[PDB]
Amino acid sequence: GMALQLSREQGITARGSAEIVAEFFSFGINSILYQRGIYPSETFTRVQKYGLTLLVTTDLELIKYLNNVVEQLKDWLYKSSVQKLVVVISNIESGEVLERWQFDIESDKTASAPREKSQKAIQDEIRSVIRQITATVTFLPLLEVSCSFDLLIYTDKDLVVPEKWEESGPQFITNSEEVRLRSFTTTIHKVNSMVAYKIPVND
Ligand SMILES: [Cl-]
Ligand SMILES: [Cl-]
Ligand SMILES: [Cl-]
Ligand SMILES: [Mg+2]
């Protein structure tokens, strides 16, 4: 007679996309911090995500810091207010900017009914991007200096700056080359990934 179905959220909503992208950044930032030795290897634990074994921090302060960033990102991503996220890697002793992991975000401001793209398909794309973050490091110059990180979120100039957040300098890098990574999309957001790395000197 009449076909009924118990509602089961399939596809992607603007909220779902924001969730997905913010989560990707949490895992991506964790991978970069581990791969560039920002935090010691023993401060990371193995976890399953996107069909991969990924390393995520156990450091209490870093967990809270990154969680705070991810929560804020979801809000701004839903609003289509994030233009890019950059993980700046600098020589801890000199402050020299050595790498800039740049994630340019494109948004569908019209995002309404849920979009027809499976979570699986999206995870498949993210999986390749995450693998490429680790793969890319094997092609960069050997890093043999202790470094620090800065996480910069570039937003629409008109956004309200929440408490605890601050307008920061751009942390310009110079004498760099780039490695373009695979992009991924939820159909609502598209995340482009690339790393700008400084060419060292023959000293
Ligand atoms: Cl781009
Ligand atoms: Cl690899
Ligand atoms: Cl720059
Ligand atoms: Mg040297």
Name the closest ligand to CA 180: 1
- Spatial separation of the C-alpha atoms in residues 85 and 68, rounded to whole Å: 15
Enclosing H/E stretch for 73: helix 60-78
Q: What is the maximum alpha-carbon separation in the chain?
A: 80
- Spatial separation of the C-alpha atoms in residues 183 and 191, rounded to whole Å: 6
Distance 168 CA to ligand 2 centre (A): 33
Name the closest ligand to CA 106: 1
Instruction: Indicate the length of the chain as a whole number.
Output: 203
CATH of the domain at 10: 3.30.900.10
Q: Which residues contact 136 (CB under 8 A, 6 or more apart)?
A: 179, 181, 195
Name the closest ligand to CA 198: 3
Quote helix, strand, coil % in the chain, to nearest 5: 30, 30, 40
Distance 88 CA to ligand 3 centre (A): 9
Number of domains in the chain: 1
Q: Which residues contact 86 (CB under 8 A, 6 or more apart)?
A: 100, 101, 102, 103, 151, 152, 154, 171
With beta carbons less than 8 A apart as the criterion, state whether 101 and 86 touch: yes
Distance 196 CA to ligand 3 centre (A): 8
Distance 27 CA to ligand 2 centre (A): 16
What residues does the ion ligand 2 have nearby, CB within 5 Å?
A: 134-135
Instruction: Name the burial class of residue 108, with classes exposed (0-12), middle (13-18) and buried (19+) by CB atoms within 10 angstroms of its CB.
Output: middle
Structure resolution in Å? 2.0
Residue 92 has which token pair?
């801890």
Alpha helices per DSSP H over 11-59: 14-35
With beta carbons less than 8 A apart as the criterion, state whether 90 and 171 touch: yes
Give the domain range for residue 52.
1-203
Ramachandran assignment for 15, one of left (phi > 0), alpha (psi -120 to 50 degrees), beta (any other): alpha
Query: Structure solved using which method?
Result: X-ray
